[PDB]
Amino acid sequence: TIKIGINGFGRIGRMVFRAAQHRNDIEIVGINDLLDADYMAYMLKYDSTHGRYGGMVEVREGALVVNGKKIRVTSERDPANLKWNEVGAVVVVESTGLFLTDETARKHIQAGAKKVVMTGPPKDDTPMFVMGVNNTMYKGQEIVSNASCTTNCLAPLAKIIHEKFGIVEGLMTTVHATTATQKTVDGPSQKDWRGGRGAAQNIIPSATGAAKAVGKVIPALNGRLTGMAFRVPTPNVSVVDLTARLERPATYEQICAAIKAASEGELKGILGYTEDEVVSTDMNGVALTSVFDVKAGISLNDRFVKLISWYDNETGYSHKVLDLVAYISAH
């Protein structure tokens, strides 16, 4: 069993925790945040988006006891102090949002861990992996990134479309749920002025590197994709809108058939497929990283198409963080 630590018990930290509770191959042995143990237990027990936790949670002698297993709780702001080897944590999930460079993430190795997975795109040349797209390119690196939720939705889709028909060029928009970085009412966001504006009141444009990042995980698409985002007033679940110019002609039904085939084969469990009249809440809790929406998209012609794919930005990404942990542990 792979023993892991979580640094940052936030939306992703807690949903990674939840995702682990039905896996036999991974066990959480310690959690670090800026919280007392009793408060951590409360944050795990109750969830506005995903409902009440479906295990037993208690606090005993300053540790979390979840379904019988003791979990060390610490509140070290500096992860270099974490003594991960003392609880046998070999991989740390770095989900604070704050430690996205080699130097900062490597504090966990200074503290006794063997490997680290960042839960966001790096600010340096730390390698990014996306399950089902380029994870097999892993070369034993101690510190890696699982990219972003948006990259995890776009990349599996772009893989299939590019392999089957070729992407000459593509532009992406993601319509994305509100996140923790945003504000309830207009407030200060000195590095992202639009992102300070009240989240529930507004459609809020945002830059995103997620489309360009697809060219890092699919090198054939380097320079062939970019995009942007709109943040909107929903609490979870997002959607990619990819407008692509194709190398070779394909009707909309041929495109749908290729995606369906991929969802049943190579990308099973990663890329999914629906023909139902779905809305965002229908994807809340779905562990797929990309769910292609047949009826939502549209072709102008045989070489210019708009493709729509959903992603539960909390749940799917979190399950794939653990898939990446398992992958790098076996390789």
Closest distance to ligand NAD from the beta carbon of 256 (Å): 27
**Residue 10 CB partners (closer than 8 Å, separation 6+):** 33, 95, 96, 97, 180
The residue whose Cβ lies closest to ligand NAD is 10
Instruction: Say which entry of ligand NAD, its own copies, none residue 287 contacts (CB below 5 to 8 A, set by partner kind).
Output: none
Q: In DSSP terms, which residues pair with 144 in a beta bridge? A: 117
Distance between first and last Cα of the chain: 15
Task: Enumerate residues 227-266 that contact its own copies by CB under 8 A.
Answer: 227-228, 230, 232-234, 237-239, 241, 243, 245
Instruction: Say which entry of ligand NAD, its own copies, none residue 230 contacts (CB below 5 to 8 A, set by partner kind).
Output: its own copies
CA distances (Å), origin 74, targets 6, 35, 38, 66, 172:
10, 8, 12, 16, 40
Q: Is 16 exposed, middle or buried (0-12, 13-18, 19+ CB in 10 A)?
A: buried
Could you confirm whether 149 is annotated as catalytic?
Answer: yes
Pick from 95, 135, 182, 309 the residue near ligand NAD by CB under 6 A: 95
Which of 11, 10, 6, 5 has its CA nearest to residue 238?
A: 11
- Output DSSP code: residue 226: E
Q: Are 126 and 144 in contact (CB under 8 A)?
A: yes
Pick from 40, 111, 149, 221 the residue near ligand NAD by CB under 6 A: 149
- Output DSSP code: residue 183: B
Distance (Å, rounded) from C-alpha 184 to C-alpha 199?
A: 6
Instruction: Say which entry of ligand NAD, its own copies, none residue 120 contacts (CB below 5 to 8 A, set by partner kind).
Output: ligand NAD
Closest distance to its own copies from the beta carbon of 258 (Å): 19
119 is in an annotated binding site: yes
Distance (Å, rounded) from C-alpha 4 to C-alpha 300?
A: 48
Task: Enumerate residues 6-35 that contact ligand NAD by CB under 6 A.
Answer: 7-13, 32-34
CA gyration radius, the chain: 20
Which residues belong to the annotated binding site for NAD(+)? 11-12, 33, 77, 119, 313
Binding site for its own copies (CB under 8 A): 169-171, 173, 175, 193-194, 197-198, 200-205, 224-228, 230, 232-234, 237-239, 241, 243, 245, 277-281, 293, 295-298, 300-301, 304-306, 308
* Catalytic residue positions, numbered: 149
Binding site for ligand NAD (CB under 6 A): 7-13, 32-34, 77, 95-98, 119-120, 148-149, 179-180, 313-314, 317
Which residues belong to the annotated binding site for D-glyceraldehyde 3-phosphate? 148-150, 179, 208-209, 231
